[PDB]
Amino acid sequence: GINPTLFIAQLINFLLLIFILRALLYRPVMNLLNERTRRIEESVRDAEKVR
Amino acid sequence: EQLANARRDYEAEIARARQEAAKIVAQAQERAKQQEAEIIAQARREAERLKEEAR
């Protein structure tokens, strides 16, 4: 039997999940993907700037 | 490092260009001083020749 209280409890579990995983990984990992993209972009602009 | 050496070469090339331009103006001034000095001297010699042929 499906219990609405347990359903909302699954929502709270996934809220804890999403928020803690996001704050501990994804913003560091968005910084990582931005790091690679922004650094390649720095390389490109410095390439035409040096020539 | 490519950008670093390019920047340093840019300002260094400007500096060496100013050194060589200083040499160029020194050579031009030497040429001017010379040229005027013996142009006046040749004017003097021509005047002396004119006096001699007049005599």
UniProtKB/Swiss-Prot annotation, chain A:
Q: Which residues cross the membrane?
A: 1-20
Q: How does it assemble?
A: F-type ATPases have 2 components, F(1) - the catalytic core - and F(0) - the membrane proton channel. F(1) has five subunits: alpha(3), beta(3), gamma(1), delta(1), epsilon(1). F(0) has four main subunits: a(1), b(2) and c(10-14). The alpha and beta chains form an alternating ring which encloses part of the gamma chain. F(1) is attached to F(0) by a central stalk formed by the gamma and epsilon chains, while a peripheral stalk is formed by the delta and b chains.
Subcellular localization is given as: Cell membrane
**Family (UniProt):** Belongs to the ATPase B chain family.
The protein's name is ATP synthase subunit b
Role:
F(1)F(0) ATP synthase produces ATP from ADP in the presence of a proton or sodium gradient. F-type ATPases consist of two structural domains, F(1) containing the extramembraneous catalytic core and F(0) containing the membrane proton channel, linked together by a central stalk and a peripheral stalk. During catalysis, ATP synthesis in the catalytic domain of F(1) is coupled via a rotary mechanism of the central stalk subunits to proton translocation. Component of the F(0) channel, it forms part of the peripheral stalk, linking F(1) to F(0).
Q: List the disulfide bonds.
A: none
The stretch of the full-length protein covered here is 5 to 55 of 164
